[PDB]
Amino acid sequence: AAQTNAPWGLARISSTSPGTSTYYYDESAGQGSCVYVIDTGIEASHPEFEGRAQMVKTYYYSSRDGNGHGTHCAGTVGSRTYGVAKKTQLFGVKVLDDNGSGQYSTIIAGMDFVASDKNNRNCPKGVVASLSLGGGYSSSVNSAAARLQSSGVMVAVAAGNNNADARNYSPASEPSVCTVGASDRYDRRSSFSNYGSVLDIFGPGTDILSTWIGGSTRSISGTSMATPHVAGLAAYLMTLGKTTAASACRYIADTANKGDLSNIPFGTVNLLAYNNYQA
């Protein structure tokens, strides 16, 4: 399948070269997979989700996304126009309030929730979790992300946005999950992207168009935006049978575009997520 005039990040993850604008992908499109977006919520009523999104847990007085960030990330995973995996099922877990903030204990509870709740959901092709959040190093937060991964969920986490080594941030620094840095449309590391040996992969993160609350769209930047490209890619590849939740991060790294990014510090992987799709 081909989606013309796609957002640059979708085109990038289906291309061996920067500078193209069509997204190419197998029409299975993540059907039969599920992606949990652990964030500020998801505006599931947005036409872009087509009934495929639903809120399943909140830790606040409402499940509404009053911020937009979670809706944007969910859109990059799985919206019809802005998403990598256009037929996946999206589940919202609101661990962040409408200011984008959350206590570490709430974030941990949300991760443990997903590890259990996936047993209540029909996801025969596999389960992914997208975590576009973080803060300072916490062994408890890392342990929770490791538990979620070990339960059979592909965990993709943002590296963080401090132009610093991700080893000092959580859950970015947990080795067993998939830690995602950000790149721009000219194949440069995004200026804010964290780096370091703990990174597994880069995805598009600068000027990413996706869904927003109020039935709208907008372009924003962050490792928060790179993470759902990788989560959606994992769901897409799991639906194709090419990998599993336990192996998908390694598979994405093995099949990535290699050596194409600039401003990668020595010791950080130079790997850009790529779907390897051949029409």
UniProtKB/Swiss-Prot annotation:
Keywords for the protein's UniProt record, in alphabetical order: Calcium, Disulfide bond, Hydrolase, Metal-binding, Protease, Serine protease, Signal, Zymogen
A molecular-function term among this protein's GO annotations: metal ion binding
Keyword hit for Protease: yes
Domain Peptidase S8: from-to ranges: 7-279
Catalyzed chemical reaction(s): Hydrolysis of keratin, and of other proteins with subtilisin-like specificity. Hydrolyzes peptide amides
GO terms, biological process: proteolysis
Keyword presence, Calcium: yes
Chain positions recorded as Ca(2+) 1 binding sites: 175, 177, 200
Enzyme Commission number(s) of this protein: 3.4.21.64
Active site, UniProt feature: 39, 69, 224
Cofactor requirements of the protein: Ca(2+)
Residues annotated as binding Ca(2+) 2: 16, 260
Cofactor note: Binds 2 calcium ions per subunit.
Disulfide bonds: 34-123, 178-249
Gene Ontology, cellular component aspect: extracellular region
Function field: Hydrolyzes keratin at aromatic and hydrophobic residues.
Family the UniProt entry places it in: Belongs to the peptidase S8 family.
Protein name per UniProt: Proteinase K
Organism field: Parengyodontium album
Lineage, opening ranks: Eukaryota, Fungi, Dikarya, Ascomycota, Pezizomycotina
Residues of the full protein shown: 106 to 384 of 384
